[PDB]
Amino acid sequence: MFERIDYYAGDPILGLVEKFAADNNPDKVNLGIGIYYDESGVMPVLDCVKIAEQRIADPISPRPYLPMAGLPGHRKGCQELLFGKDAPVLKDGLVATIATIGGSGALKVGAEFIHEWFPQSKCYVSDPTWGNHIAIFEGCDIEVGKYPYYDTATGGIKFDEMIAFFETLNKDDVLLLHPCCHNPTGVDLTREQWDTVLNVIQERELIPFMDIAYQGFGEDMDSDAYAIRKAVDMGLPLFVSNSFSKNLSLYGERVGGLSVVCPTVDETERVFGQLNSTVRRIYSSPPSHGGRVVDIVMNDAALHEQWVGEVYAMRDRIKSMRTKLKSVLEAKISGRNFDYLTAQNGMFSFTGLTPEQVERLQSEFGIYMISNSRMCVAGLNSSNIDYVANAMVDVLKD
Amino acid sequence: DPILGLVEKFAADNNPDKVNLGIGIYYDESGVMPVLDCVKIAEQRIADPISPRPYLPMAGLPGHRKGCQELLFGKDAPVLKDGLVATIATIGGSGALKVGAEFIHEWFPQSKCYVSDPTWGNHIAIFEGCDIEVGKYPYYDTATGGIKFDEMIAFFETLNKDDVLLLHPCCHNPTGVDLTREQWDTVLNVIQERELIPFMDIAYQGFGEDMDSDAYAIRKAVDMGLPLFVSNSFSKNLSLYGERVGGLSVVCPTVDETERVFGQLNSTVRRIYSSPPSHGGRVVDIVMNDAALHEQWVGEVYAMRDRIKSMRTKLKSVLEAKISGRNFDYLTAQNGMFSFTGLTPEQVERLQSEFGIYMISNSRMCVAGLNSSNIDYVANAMVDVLKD
Ligand SMILES: *Cc1c(COP(=O)(O)O)cnc(C)c1O
Ligand SMILES: *Cc1c(COP(=O)(O)O)cnc(C)c1O
Ligand SMILES: O=C(O)[C@@H](O)Cc1c[nH]c2ccccc12
Ligand SMILES: [Mg+2]
Ligand SMILES: [Mg+2]
């Protein structure tokens, strides 16, 4: 009956968290999952979230179904963050937006929409990409391919090879792009590079699906959203999935959004209706709590401002560890370049360590990373940094 | 939803004495959605201290899963002691149905699903959303006001091995009309005989008789050693529609087959939404696995159960005081918050335009919309349309 069902190998990222918790080392360090940890080494509750949550709890409200699209303020908050407050596209009523179960739920709903309305469309993800990108899209019965992205030889982007790749594709083929803070390489495109990319997307009439999960961790909110906002300004059929998991430090509550930028108000209504309908088929409506937190924080002027402040402090703390690590690494190893540490953006960096070197760090030192050498920089702090440096140089000499 | 056109017609009605019985939500005596005291206590515990918010395991919280398992199958049911049930926390019962269907589609691609005539609207949409061919088995008989039982079994016999039946264990939506224990016993015997897959969808456990009775069809199917899928929802019994709390349980012949299935359930969650929501999971975890809170919760559910039966009684007694030839026992014979009132689509219309009392044109009424300040208004309005 069930003997035919295959064993599930386990999620590489989420299985690793349990190996970390199950490990009983004094100096254990988790650079595996894309979570931000404070200077103390613990996952913070943002102050703005704390105020918001005290509001929700005072008093305790009845809990009806949210609209399928989630809360108006949650939707507005997604939109204003991605496109800009008072953006003409928003004022023209041209973006259809739903609350989703994290960035993951946004990717699902989006891909399902794409599958249904563009059944011949093939999706293409970065080489490499965040693993779950492939799983979500194939889950909708869409054929998934890679586009050359990361120059595994140089630690930069195979830009020409990538561009030449996008010229070969079919109309309405879907590119799954990282607007900023690449997962897992940390290697982003320059503005100028985005311009050329987005020019090709137009000429070839491909569908951009931008997946953004670390807005505010790269440069700043508006700057990180460049690729999104440019695409809008060019008039492209845009899909955006956004996540508040990371910048609201609210991973567990499953907060995200999906926005579809449309040619007309009436097409917006149609797509929005379709989005609502896709949601109905998957989970009916999104969770209330996470929704309210997003709503309350995004649309309270003082909380929004405080939140922006808190995201940048996170961004700054990550950036300072990049340079603190680079400097203590620099001194210990002569024969190697460490420029990638301060050149990459976001929570992640490709260290360029072999799967073996990654696993020696795990076994001997209790330092956790993905086998592809991805390191979550956020797990570093002034306590563990001399320890991780010392460990890295000990695995690099060997 | 088709309900949303009705909700739109209802808001469009200016009648100040209007009543919405087309709702699919429990209201208390004051005609509002209640916050349960056990939920209120739970959420006060979650609020102090505000705790960091890691991802949940893709399966949800251990306690959420254990909660679902003990509620469905019985505290220390052998099937649990034997570890023969794969259980994940889900985005309500909706998300439980989704994971279930996609699972079935991936591994039993040839399987067709059959839902009751009639059923909860989304049953069809969810399974059709997975590229499963969905049909209807006969259930409700308009002529008797009960179950086309013989015809239903007859339909079940014509179905292939591994075909899926969507079965309401109790408190049938939208009719209120339930199978007896005897009727269940033969159903599960047909299902076993034909090696069909029982998919049971339980959203109103505790609104029918009690927790254990409501779960009869579930627990028997386990005793018989059937390949049972269960989707359960706390939306209603926990009054937590918006936090999206349910479970999906799959009962397997072997400990090893459970690990395989539990594995794919996880892999399915991974492709849809990565992991379920922290808050709702915690409320379920606290309320199910705190002994006193569990008792209080059970009590509060039975208070709702009893309020529904209190309104079913009052309505019938007003009706029977005026009409003699009909047997209204079916109003009290039905269970949960839904009632096929057996009014003609024309009679439903009459109630709308004359009284602003809103039912679904298939005679469906949500009994929980009745409270002491509209019961007499609504009962009397009904006598008029039946007298016309
Ligand atoms: C972490 C991540 C996600 C997942 O976001 P959730 O809010 O957890 O669903 C999606 N895309 C990328 C690129 C990510 O890094
Ligand atoms: C309400 C209901 C569901 C779905 O419950 P949710 O928790 O809101 O997803 C499923 N089946 C039936 C019969 C229902 O009444
Ligand atoms: O990128 C990271 O570091 C994580 O956010 C990924 C991640 C977190 N939870 C998951 C569940 C399934 C698949 C991937 C994930
Ligand atoms: Mg599908
Ligand atoms: Mg507000």
Author numbering:
A (entry chain A): 1 to 398
B (entry chain B): 11 to 398
Original authors' sentences:
The psychrophilic aromatic aminotransferase from Psychrobacter sp. B6 is a representative of pyridoxal phosphate (PLP)-dependent enzymes. PsyArAT exhibits an activity typical for ArAT: transamination, which is a transfer of an amine group between aromatic α-amino acids and α-ketoacids. B6 is discussed based on crystal structures of complexes with four hydroxy-analogs of substrates: phenylalanine, tyrosine, tryptophan and aspartic acid. These competitive inhibitors are bound in the active center of PsyArAT but do not undergo transamination reaction, which makes them an outstanding tool for examination of the enzyme catalytic center.
PsyArAT/WOH was another complex with different crystallographic properties, as it crystallized in a C2 group as a double dimer with noncrystallographical symmetry. In PsyArAT/WOH, PLP was added to the crystallization solution, which helped to obtain very good electron density maps for the cofactor. Tryptophan hydroxy-analog (WOH) created a network of contacts, enabling the involvement of both termini and a large domain, which resulted in closure conformation. High similarity of interactions with an inhibitor in catalytic centers of monomers A and C allowed for the description of only one of them, and we arbitrary choose monomer A. The carboxylic group of the WOH is planar to the Arg374 guanidine group, and two hydrogen bonds of 3.2 Å and 2.9 Å are made between them. The another contact in the length of 2.4 Å, of the mentioned carboxyl group, was made with the peptide bond hydrogen of Gly34, being part of the motile, long entrance loop. Additionally, side chain nitrogen atoms of Trp130 and Asn183, from the large domain, make hydrogen bonds (3.4 Å and 3.2 Å) with the carboxyl group of the ligand. Internal aldimine present in the catalytic center interacts with the carboxyl group of the WOH; the bond between the Schiff base nitrogen and oxygen atom is 3.2 Å long. Like in the case of the remaining complexes with aromatic ligands, FOH and YOH, Arg280*, from the second monomer, is in the “down” position, and one of its terminal nitrogen atoms creates two hydrogen bonds with side chains of Tyr8 and Asp11 (3.2 Å and 2.6 Å). Interestingly, in the active site of monomer A and C in the PsyArAT/WOH complex, the presence of a big, hydrophobic indole group of the WOH molecule, just near the Arg280* residue, prevented its contact with the Asn132 side chain (which was pushed away from the active pocket). Baffling was a lack of WOH in one monomer of each dimer in PsyArAT/WOH, which resulted in a huge difference in the volume of the active pocket, with the tryptophan hydroxy-analog present or absent in the active center.
